[PDB]
Amino acid sequence: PIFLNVLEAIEPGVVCAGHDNNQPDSFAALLSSLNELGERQLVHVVKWAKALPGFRNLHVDDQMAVIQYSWMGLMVFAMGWRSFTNVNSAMLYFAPDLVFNEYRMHKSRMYSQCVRMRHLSQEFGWLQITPQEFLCMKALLLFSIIPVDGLKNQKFFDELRMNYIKELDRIIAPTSCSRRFYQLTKLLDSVQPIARELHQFTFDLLIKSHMVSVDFPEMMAEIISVQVPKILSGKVKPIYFHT
Amino acid sequence: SSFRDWYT
Numbered sequence: 001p002i003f004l005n006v007l008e009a010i011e012p013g014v015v016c017a018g019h020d021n022n023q024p025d026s027f028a029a030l031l032s033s034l035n036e037l038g039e040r041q042l043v044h045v046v047k048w049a050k051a052l053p054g055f056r057n058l059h060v061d062d063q064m065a066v067i068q069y070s071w072m073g074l075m076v077f078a079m080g081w082r083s084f085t086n087v088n089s090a091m092l093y094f095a096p097d098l099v100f101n102e103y104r105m106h107k108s109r110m111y112s113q114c115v116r117m118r119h120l121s122q123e124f125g126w127l128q129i130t131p132q133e134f135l136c137m138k139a140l141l142l143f144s145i146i147p148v149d150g151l152k153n154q155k156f157f158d159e160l161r162m163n164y165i166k167e168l169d170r171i172i173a174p175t176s177c178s179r180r181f182y183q184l185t186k187l188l189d190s191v192q193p194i195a196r197e198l199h200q201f202t203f204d205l206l207i208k209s210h211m212v213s214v215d216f217p218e219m220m221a222e223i224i225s226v227q228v229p230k231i232l233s234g235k236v237k238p239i240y241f242h243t
Numbered sequence: 244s245s246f247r248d249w250y251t
């Protein structure tokens with residue numbers, strides 16, 4: 001199954017957040033540490049993406065574009081998985097040195113969102129998702145948000161996407177092998193409104209970040225200020241399986 | 244952009 005080989009091979013490892021657990025759980029520290037993590041996990045997302053099958057066939061601006069649009073969802077999906085596998089979904093396994101219990105969920109002022117992410121995590125258990133399914137689904141997520149008028153080379157993108165769908169089809173490869181497809185497509189859809197809420201939250205946060213002493217690393221601030229607003233303003237949209 | 248230059 002050459003495609004799995006790749007996905008299993010290139011899957012990024014553990015990434016620590018750099019969080020000082022000796023300090024108390026302030027809003028500023030939890031959030032500056034999550035911003036750091038984000039910047040760290042983006043390095044790995046980039047390296048991973050470049051090594052995906054067919055990915056470097058996309059025009060290079062498209063390449064950068066889809067990474068910058070889809071990092072949240074990708075990162076949230078992978079964090080849901082880690083939480084499922086390491087803490088059976090009581091808490092949120094952001095990094096081994098940044099595990100959110102409920103207190104941290106409240107202190108982050110993103111309790112609401114963290115509730116939605118914990119559901120996502122539970123669903124990994126609820127649905128008995130295999131590692132191979134996770135991987136194929138996670139890759140699809142890279143190809144699940146685009147400009148509404150399209151990318152420079154949109155035809156190559158649609159083809160690639162098609163192909164990642166068939167792979168998820170294949171790893172599922174006729175009443176379960178169909179109702180299953182319904183379920184995972186459903187689960188993938190569910191990532192989008194959660195990422196939507198985090199985009200809104202982080203963008204709001206970056207705007208008021210001098211007022212609250214929250215540090216945003218360089219590329220995170222660029223992406224939040226240039227790219228995220230295209231999603232928030234409706235210029236860039238998720239692609240859903242189901243309407 | 245800083246991303247445009249890291250990625251290339």
Ligand SMILES: C[C@]12CCC(=O)C[C@@H]1CC[C@@H]1[C@@H]2CC[C@]2(C)[C@@H](O)CC[C@@H]12
Nearest residue numbers: 034035037038041075076079094198202
């Ligand atoms: C993607 C990250 C960081 C990586 C991860 O495992 C998931 C997590 C989801 C919440 C994001 C966070 C990056 C920092 C953000 C964007 C904060 O600014 C607000 C919401 C945070």
